[PDB]
Amino acid sequence: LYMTF
Amino acid sequence: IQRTPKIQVYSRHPAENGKSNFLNCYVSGFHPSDIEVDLLKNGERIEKVEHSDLSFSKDWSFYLLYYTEFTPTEKDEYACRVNHVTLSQPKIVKWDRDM
Amino acid sequence: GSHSMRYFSTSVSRPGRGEPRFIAVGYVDDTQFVRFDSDAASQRMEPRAPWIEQEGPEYWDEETGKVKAHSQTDRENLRIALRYYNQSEAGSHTLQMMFGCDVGSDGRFLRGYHQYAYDGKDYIALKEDLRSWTAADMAAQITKRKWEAAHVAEQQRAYLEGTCVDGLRRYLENGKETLQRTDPPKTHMTHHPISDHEATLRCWALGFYPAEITLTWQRDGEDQTQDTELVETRPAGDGTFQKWAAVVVPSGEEQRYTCHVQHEGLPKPLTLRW
């Protein structure tokens, strides 16, 4: 079963 | 960072003339990921060669398996040719039945 | 024993070639199970192992949804990284990410991982406490402050303690016959004279799973560490692994050397002698 810098 | 590939070329099973088999070229420990890996039969590039999905180790360096089905004979020579930014000319590693 | 699940992903920017290539792969222990390739025609998460195909298309619909979202995030992260390091748009750059969990033999959560590398070096990583971040440089410290303020760690801990562990337990039972198997190494020795007075002894381990193994040469019981030639463990391509170890011995003294093979599929360590 598999926000920015 | 730049890391040169480690290269191993080898058969899935110990080679027996006339018995079908798989020829492998395993490249690992390299960065960046763009690399070209060809399997050669008597100097000639083998046409149908598959490879594993790009993955990497705990230290972030990449590894790939290139492979093709083949039937060894006593006369035929095989090699792997690896082309990577860290290499001024492609490295050609010959297949040795005992390595 | 213990088990682990890992998702790996790589993003490589190619400025004149269009948008970055994104490749993700999942693993249970040493066995790959899923893959996604952004350049592939499918645009789906695809099965790479027999035991994962029995999942329904709602699993696949959700998994390719989440992996597609990841490729978009890491694409924007590649551009943010260019700004932070003040790098030109000419160059190709790489963003790697790993995440996943370990469980014990009773299936309990042991460890979890969420971490990134930029151009092959550590960028930011979640600590073992799963509340704090390790920033590797000044650029990563900006990301750390941003994620501390947004409480990113709490989300990841929830995923890593809950969803990751449940996925891993399920795959382990559904794939019990391949994944909980143990294949012992098939071993043998080769012997080649290299001169009048010297010969090579090579000790082979073939067809073993999982990859972890130890091959050691001794002379009269003394470890030959510095004098042993050793190759990295390598995949055979059928799901098993191979390794060998070699020493150069004086001709006629072959019987003084022993090769020792330890693997978790062997009842007891193996000793080979030419």
Numbering used by the authors:
A (entry chain E): 1 to 2, 9 to 11
B (entry chain B): 21 to 119
C (entry chain A): 1 to 274
Kindly provide excerpts from the paper associated with this entry.
Due to the low resolution (3.3 Å) of the first data set from HLA-A*2402/H7-P25, we collected another data set which had higher resolution (2.3 Å). In HLA-A*2402+ individuals, we confirmed that peptide H7-P25 could induce lower cross-reactivity than peptide H1-P25 only in pH1N1-specific T cells. Further, the HLA-A*2402/H1-P25 complex was more thermally stable (with a melting temperature [Tm] of 48.8°C) than the HLA-A*2402/H7-P25 complex (with Tm = 46.4°C). Despite the fact that the I9M mutation is not located in the traditional primary anchoring positions of HLA I binding peptides, peptide H7-P25 displayed a minor decreased binding affinity for HLA-A*2402 compared to H1/H5-derived peptide H1-P25. Taking these data together, though the H7-P25 peptide has only one dominant I9M mutation, this mutation influences the antigenicity of the peptide, most likely by altering both HLA binding and TCR recognition. In the structures of HLA-A*2402 with H1/H5-derived peptide H1-P25 and H7/H9-specific epitope H7-P25, the I9M substitution influenced the solvent-exposed surface and decreased the force of anchoring of the peptide to HLA-A*2402.
In this study, more than half (54.5%) of the subjects had the HLA-A*2402 allele, and M1 protein-derived peptide H1-P25 (M1 99–109; LYKKLKREITF in pH1N1) with HLA-A*2402 restriction is 1 of the 11 peptides. P25 is conserved between H1N1 and H5N1 (named peptide H1-P25) but has a dominant mutation with substitutions at position 9 from Ile to Met (I9M) (named peptide H7-P25) in H7N9 and H9N2 and Ile to Val (I9V) in H6N1. To further interpret the immunogenicity transition at the molecular level, we determined the crystal structures of HLA-A*2402 in complex with peptide H1-P25 or H7-P25 (data set 1). Peptide-MHC (pMHC) structure determination indicated a molecular basis for the immune cross-reactivity between pH1N1 and H5N1, as well as the lack of cross-reactivities toward other AIVs, especially H7N9.
